[PDB]
Amino acid sequence: DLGSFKANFIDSDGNQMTDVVEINFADATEKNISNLLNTLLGRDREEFTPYRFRIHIPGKDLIIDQYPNDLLSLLQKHGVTNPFETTITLSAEPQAIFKVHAVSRLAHRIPGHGQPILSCQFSPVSSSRLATGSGDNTARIWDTDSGTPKFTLKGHTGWVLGVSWSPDGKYLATCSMDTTVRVWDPESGKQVNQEFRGHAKWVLALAWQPYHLWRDGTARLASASKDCTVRIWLVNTGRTEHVLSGHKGSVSCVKWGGTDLIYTGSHDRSVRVWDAVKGTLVHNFTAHGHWVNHIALSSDHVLRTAYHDHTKEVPGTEEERRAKAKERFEKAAKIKGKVAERLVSASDDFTMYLWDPTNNGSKPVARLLGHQNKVNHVQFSPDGTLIASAGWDNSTKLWNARDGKFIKNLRGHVAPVYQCAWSADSRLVVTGSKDCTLKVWNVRTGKLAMDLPGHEDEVYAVDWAADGELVASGGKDKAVRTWRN
């Protein structure tokens, strides 16, 4: 009946995935073509990768990201005069094997904090445990199964600006205006040893060393401070291994990547890359024309949870745990077959820069222009294909993580957007706003999927648990809220 076409399958790198193959238009659904590609690649029936396909419109420079209900008509609409003897290039984008359901309603409101919540993060193990940091000088651990307080972590004498679980879930770290970092046991609620002292001013951000890189029988932890330095701590002994010095202004943000590089952004308007093992400066990016206050790595989500994944399988031994954590990172961070993390940074002049240190050094991949006010948060999607940026201009913007191109606005908030958080399958993003709402966005369609009123005041912090089940939020009204499907 309907005709056929030759298909040229290329991956995200632009490399041909299989030899050219003929496909009937009658069979040309995304599902069937995805099934076909999996088959051509020799995959096992039970190990198929779900593909979506960007269609390269023959005769022009347009790439369609949303697969059409009828391929033939899409081609004819675009003036493909001979659809039956033109090779169609299809970019294959692998999708998550699992699906995260959009949260849709309040699960629990839990009061406890006496001042605003500034930070919140789920355990990398499951959504059953949540941590928050507050201007009441405490962190808290919450039982999200029942919506009850679990532990109050007291000891800090200034605002808790950040909480961060160790990637294996065994520790929680907190940083504070009191110039200290504290490490806690989230199962017992007890502080581990003494406070980490050394910074001269407020401690602004934390980054755990990825689990698969731990050595000397200890976890390592990086802290960024207003004192313009980063310190690397040995967690077991509380000793500072390295002081990363050179920034001429406050180090507002810090990330620790899967090849043992540390990344920093500063009010001295620079973004720097450091060798964590040697404590030496590797790259100094000076493109920004204003204070840098936020950075993100393409690999953040996979490094956030070490060996913990959607399978809920935890390997038995230290070695196996390391191996699985490493394998997950390398599978997620390889571009063109080589491990290569990307970095995005934001300055107060509304600008973002996209970096590929491995392949570009200090020449940025792209400059990301479009926001009409400051960026308050930026996150790569877990699969590293997209960037979401939360703006003071009431918008969240989506960008291509490969070339920095603007893709679409997420419009809906009526006040500054303070944070965003990706679902683990890269399909959804949740945002929290000054307007006291959370909104869940369908990334593929660009549309509001779910609107979540409830908070009595501004929302400062949001997280989407890696297992997908719960979203958490907190802000000026002091009570934590969890959200469920």
Side-chain angles (χ1 to χ4, degrees):
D1 298 340
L2 311 184
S4 62
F5 68 93
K6 291 215 286 290
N8 170 48
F9 292 109
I10 62 170
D11 61 26
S12 65
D13 297 326
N15 297 331
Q16 197 180 58
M17 293 176 64
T18 198
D19 297 319
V20 172
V21 60
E22 181 168 351
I23 307 172
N24 299 324
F25 279 99
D27 302 320
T29 62
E30 197 170 48
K31 204 66 158 295
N32 287 340
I33 290 178
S34 175
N35 283 334
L36 177 59
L37 180 55
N38 271 290
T39 302
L40 296 178
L41 290 172
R43 302 248 183 72
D44 288 350
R45 286 252 190 278
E46 282 212 298
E47 303 196 86
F48 273 15
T49 295
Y51 291 101
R52 287 205 332 154
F53 298 97
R54 316 173 68 198
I55 301 164
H56 295 234
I57 303 299
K60 59 187 63 173
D61 307 330
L62 185 58
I63 297 174
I64 305 302
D65 290 282
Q66 288 169 339
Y67 198 82
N69 182 84
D70 169 26
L71 173 61
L72 186 54
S73 58
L74 180 68
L75 298 175
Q76 298 162 316
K77 188 176 74 70
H78 277 107
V80 179
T81 182
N82 194 349
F84 310 97
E85 290 184 342
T86 52
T87 300
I88 316 299
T89 295
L90 304 179
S91 281
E93 195 71 85
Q95 271 64 65
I97 305 177
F98 59 98
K99 170 189 173 59
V100 179
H101 299 333
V103 294
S104 73
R105 73 182 165 281
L106 184 72
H108 292 102
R109 174 187 183 275
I110 332 177
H113 281 307
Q115 296 295 339
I117 298 171
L118 306 177
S119 177
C120 80
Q121 182 173 84
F122 285 99
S123 162
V125 185
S126 78
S127 63
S128 71
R129 296 289 183 271
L130 177 74
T132 52
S134 173
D136 68 13
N137 293 0
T138 73
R140 280 176 172 255
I141 306 298
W142 309 94
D143 182 335
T144 73
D145 292 328
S146 60
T148 48
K150 187 70 159 172
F151 303 114
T152 306
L153 312 176
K154 325 184 175 198
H156 282 297
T157 56
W159 299 0
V160 179
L161 301 176
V163 301
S164 188
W165 297 74
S166 63
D168 63 346
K170 293 287 179 59
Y171 303 112
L172 178 78
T174 61
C175 61
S176 174
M177 295 186 60
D178 65 14
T179 75
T180 70
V181 166
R182 292 182 184 257
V183 172
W184 313 81
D185 186 332
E187 286 195 2
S188 70
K190 308 191 189 81
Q191 184 177 296
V192 176
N193 293 338
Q194 303 91 325
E195 62 267 31
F196 291 3
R197 294 193 178 277
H199 282 300
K201 300 179 177 184
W202 311 334
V203 192
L204 302 181
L206 305 156
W208 287 89
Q209 182 188 40
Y211 181 80
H212 67 279
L213 296 168
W214 292 357
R215 56 191 172 87
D216 304 324
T218 187
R220 275 165 165 82
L221 172 62
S223 50
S225 174
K226 185 177 173 62
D227 70 9
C228 309
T229 71
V230 162
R231 291 166 90 91
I232 296 169
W233 312 86
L234 308 191
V235 181
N236 288 349
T237 57
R239 162 189 175 260
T240 298
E241 175 177 44
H242 296 303
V243 178
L244 308 188
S245 301
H247 277 297
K248 286 299 197 300
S250 175
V251 192
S252 54
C253 48
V254 63
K255 297 295 170 183
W256 201 321
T259 64
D260 238 348
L261 297 176
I262 285 167
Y263 303 79
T264 58
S266 175
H267 291 180
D268 68 8
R269 305 164 49 152
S270 75
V271 172
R272 295 185 181 206
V273 186
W274 317 77
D275 191 319
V277 174
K278 308 167 191 174
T280 53
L281 182 64
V282 173
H283 299 293
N284 186 13
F285 308 151
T286 55
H288 281 279
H290 214 307
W291 298 0
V292 169
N293 274 291
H294 312 276
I295 60 173
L297 296 177
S298 51
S299 54
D300 285 340
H301 191 275
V302 291
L303 295 172
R304 183 193 169 186
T305 72
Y307 48 86
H308 297 288
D309 62 8
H310 74 283
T311 71
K312 278 109 78 180
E313 311 169 9
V314 176
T317 65
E318 294 290 289
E319 297 82 12
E320 298 181 86
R321 278 161 181 171
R322 270 174 74 85
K324 184 176 177 207
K326 189 179 178 285
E327 164 189 305
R328 292 187 67 244
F329 161 68
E330 290 186 343
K331 282 186 166 52
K334 266 168 176 174
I335 71 161
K336 272 108 80 164
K338 283 117 65 183
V339 171
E341 302 171 299
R342 286 177 311 285
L343 171 77
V344 65
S345 58
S347 35
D348 295 355
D349 61 353
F350 317 164
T351 295
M352 282 171 289
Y353 278 99
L354 172 56
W355 314 92
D356 189 336
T358 301
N359 300 296
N360 289 30
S362 60
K363 224 62 173 178
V365 171
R367 185 184 57 189
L368 277 58
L369 293 182
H371 277 295
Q372 294 171 347
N373 201 341
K374 307 187 186 304
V375 178
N376 202 78
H377 200 230
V378 63
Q379 299 274 274
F380 281 88
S381 66
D383 65 14
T385 61
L386 295 173
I387 297 157
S389 55
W392 275 77
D393 55 1
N394 312 344
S395 75
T396 299
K397 292 185 169 60
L398 293 173
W399 320 74
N400 191 311
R402 270 67 174 264
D403 60 17
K405 281 191 198 185
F406 172 70
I407 303 176
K408 67 187 75 168
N409 271 338
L410 303 178
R411 279 300 176 173
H413 285 301
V414 300
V417 186
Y418 284 148
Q419 271 192 358
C420 65
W422 288 89
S423 60
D425 65 352
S426 297
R427 285 186 185 101
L428 303 168
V429 51
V430 62
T431 55
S433 172
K434 191 179 178 74
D435 68 19
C436 309
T437 71
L438 277 64
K439 291 185 186 331
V440 182
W441 310 90
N442 187 318
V443 151
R444 268 101 335 103
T445 73
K447 300 295 191 300
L448 178 72
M450 206 70 51
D451 183 43
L452 302 172
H455 277 286
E456 298 87 17
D457 214 336
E458 304 172 359
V459 178
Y460 295 160
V462 299
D463 187 32
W464 202 327
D467 66 9
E469 297 285 319
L470 294 184
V471 164
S473 58
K476 187 171 183 187
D477 66 43
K478 301 184 290 267
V480 204
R481 280 175 157 83
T482 54
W483 308 87
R484 69 189 213 266
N485 171 78

